[PDB]
Amino acid sequence: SAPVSIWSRVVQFGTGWGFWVSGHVFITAKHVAPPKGTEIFGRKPGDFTVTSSGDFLKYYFTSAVRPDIPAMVLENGCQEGVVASVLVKRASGEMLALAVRMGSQAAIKIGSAVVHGQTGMLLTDLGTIPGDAGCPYVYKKGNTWVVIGVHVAATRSGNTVIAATHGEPTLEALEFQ
């Protein structure tokens, strides 16, 4: 479904994967990233800036690292009900697009961390596995592909997954009633 060229944007990173949103912007799961202050893609700290929000991590490079790729829209999650695709790469280079119905956005507790993200329900042993964190969630919005977050967590059994998103909630901020 997703354009063939989009997969070259998914690369190994730390103990997981990350995604080039543009030639300048690389997103990943905080928990898989190399330690802060590590040289990456041949660039030293200072040649890039890093922002984190929950388990979402974004690197911005002043000079393009991948000039061969057009910029894509990065959204803070998407509307509940959107059928998105997790672009999972495995170490072998195998590419597995996993259909997922996006659920609600919330601040989700995973172990000792709190992740701002969006829940999802895998539509199909053939889901995500340890090592997949950082792979992007994308969908075709109208007539263009947009990225909404990165894979961070799943249940062992069952089809629940969590994508970390870049923002903290306003309209989507949960409050006791």
Numbering used by the authors: 0 to 123, 131 to 183
Publication excerpt:
ORF2 and ORF3 encode the major and minor capsid proteins respectively, while ORF1 encodes a non-structural polyprotein that is cleaved into functional units by the viral protease (NS6pro). X-ray crystallographic analysis of the NS6 protease from three different strains of human norovirus has revealed the protein to be a cysteine protease with a chymotrypsin-like fold, similar to that of the 3C proteases from picornaviruses. The NS6pro fold is composed of two β-barrel domains tightly packed against each other; the interface between these two domains forms the peptide-binding cleft at the centre of which is the protease active site, a catalytic triad consisting of cysteine, histidine and aspartic or glutamic acid. The amino acids on the N-terminal side of the cleaved peptide bond (the P1 position in the nomenclature of Schechter and Berger) are typically glutamine or glutamic acid, while the P1′ amino acids on the C-terminal side is usually glycine or alanine; the residues at the P2 and P4 positions tend to be large and hydrophobic in nature.
To prevent autolysis of the protease in the high concentrations used for crystallisation trials MNV NS6pro was inactivated by mutation of the active site nucleophile to alanine (C139A). The protein crystallised by hanging drop vapour diffusion in 20% w/v PEG 3350, 0.2 M KSCN, 0.1 M Bis-Tris propane pH 7.5 to yield crystals that belong to space-group C2221 and have two molecules in the asymmetric unit. They diffracted X-rays to 1.6 Å resolution, producing an electron density map of extremely good quality for residues 1–123 and 132–183 in both molecules of the asymmetric unit. The active site triad of H30, D54, and C139 (A139 in our mutated protein) is located in the centre of the peptide-binding cleft formed at the interface of these two domains. Strikingly, in our structure the flexibility of the C-terminal polypeptide has actually allowed it to associate with the peptide-binding sites of a neighbouring molecule in the crystal – a happy accident that has revealed the structure of an MNV NS6pro-peptide complex. For chain A, the interaction is symmetric: it donates its C-terminus to a neighbouring A-chain that is related by crystallographic two-fold symmetry and binds the C-terminus received from this molecule. In contrast, chain B donates its C-terminus to a neighbouring B-chain but binds the C-terminus of a third molecule (also a B-chain). The adventitious insertion of the NS6pro C-terminus into the peptide-binding cleft of neighbouring proteases in our crystals has provided us with a detailed view of a structure that corresponds to the protease-product complex of MNV NS6pro that forms following cleavage of the NS6-NS7 junction in the viral polyprotein. The primary contacts with the protease are made by the carboxylate group of P1-Gln and side-chains of P1-Gln, P2-Phe and P4-Leu.
